[PDB]
């Protein structure tokens, strides 16, 4: 029980961290691409 | 004179003639906005 719950917690945390890092990178690139014509 | 927008007749765009007097406001029209002779334009005076 606790092992599965910890596995799910870690999986969700890792997925959220990866997705938010990807979102931050995409935001940085789309803000940098706006300055040049 | 710094012009904000125009005060255009409600039935100005309609082809059918009418005696309506009410007018609606248009704020910051574009550069290429078509203009009608029956208009009043909001603007500013620099004089005491």
């Amino acid at each position: 029980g606790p092992a599965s719950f910890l596995v799910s917690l870690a999986s969700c945390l890792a997925l959220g961290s990866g997705l938010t890092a990807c979102r931050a990178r995409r935001r940085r690139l789309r803000t940098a691409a706006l300055r040049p014509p | 004179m710094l012009c904000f927008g125009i005060y255009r007749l409600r039935d100005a765009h309609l082809s059918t003639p009418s005696q309506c007097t009410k007018r609606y406001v248009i704020t910051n029209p574009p550069y290429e906005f078509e203009l009608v002779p029956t208009d009043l334009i909001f603007c500013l005076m620099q004089f005491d």
Binding site: R35 | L2, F4, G5, Y7, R8, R10, D11, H13, R23, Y24, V25, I26, T27, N28, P29, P30, Y31, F42, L44, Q46
Partner: protein, 258 residues
Amino acid sequence: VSGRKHIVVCGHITLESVSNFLKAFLHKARDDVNVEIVFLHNISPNLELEALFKRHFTQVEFYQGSVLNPHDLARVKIESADACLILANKYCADPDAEDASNIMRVISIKNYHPKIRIITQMLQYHNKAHLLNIPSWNWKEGDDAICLAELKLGFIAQSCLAQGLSTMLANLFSMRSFIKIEEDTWQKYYLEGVSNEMYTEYLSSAFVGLSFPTVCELCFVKLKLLMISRILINPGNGTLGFFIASDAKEVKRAFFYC
């Protein structure tokens, strides 16, 4: 939370008032906000208000307390609050009682933490003066008081000067989006016009170097922006300029002009 600002909203808290405030605050046309809205009222919310708060799960919090009680102010962390927005009951039986209650709320908040910025509403001008006489209240650091009667009468007087200016200003300071009407009616032109909001931006060095009409017409023709310690309204003959534009993205290019 570190890096996450928050503001405390108190006063006349109802379903309609909170709904309007959240519609105006967390607007789609508004840029991406990063502040939390913490409501503090002494009456528990209804089922409809609870559902409305549940819709804004990660952006709106509610805490039951009294503004006059310092413990409730400490609970909502008013010391670290970015601002405190005090809402007023504009449709009250007598404006004197509501204005006096707002005075008491401002007095209590400034008593707890005098360095906080307060935005409040007023129904009479003399109550605004009474607020101006508070020791901790200073207007240079950000404290503001929107007087409903004063502003509405100013709008009406300006409309008496040029008819239709009151609705121009009302649509100008209200956040809205872009709507296209297929039918060739007056509503299409009106909705094209209403899509303009008001922004502020720092002008470039070249703009500061030149004269006001020159930079204004240069912004209007090239940048397609209408550019409107004191505030100078359309002067004659580095600095903050007031622009009218569809969104802040178009205003931002004024600083970046070469």
